Amino acid sequence: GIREKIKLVSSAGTGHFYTTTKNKRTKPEKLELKKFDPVVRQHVIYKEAK
């Protein structure tokens, strides 16, 4: 269970977020993905958090 839960928070500032897992011993850089924001109903950049 090396992979740990991480939170991806939208850059639109609406407070919505997704959850996933990441291996942090390798690939230590932040994860960025254009994902759908259900509140503003648009695709915005989500940034690593938690």
């Binding site: 839960k5 959850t19 996933t20 897992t21």
Partner: protein, 64 residues
Amino acid sequence: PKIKTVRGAAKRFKKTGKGGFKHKHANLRHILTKKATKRKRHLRPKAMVSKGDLGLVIACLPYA
């Protein structure tokens, strides 16, 4: 004496129009990253009690 309702059951069932009981689905509390979004979306709405379980629920909820 009056029959005493099971308060834990009265905090978990609600009576419907025809006399059935509705309940919140299980498996939607604390381990939610690994669960698929389709599965959680189906667990979000309320569900009717099953015919095999109406007997226990009516016994626990006399007044309702």
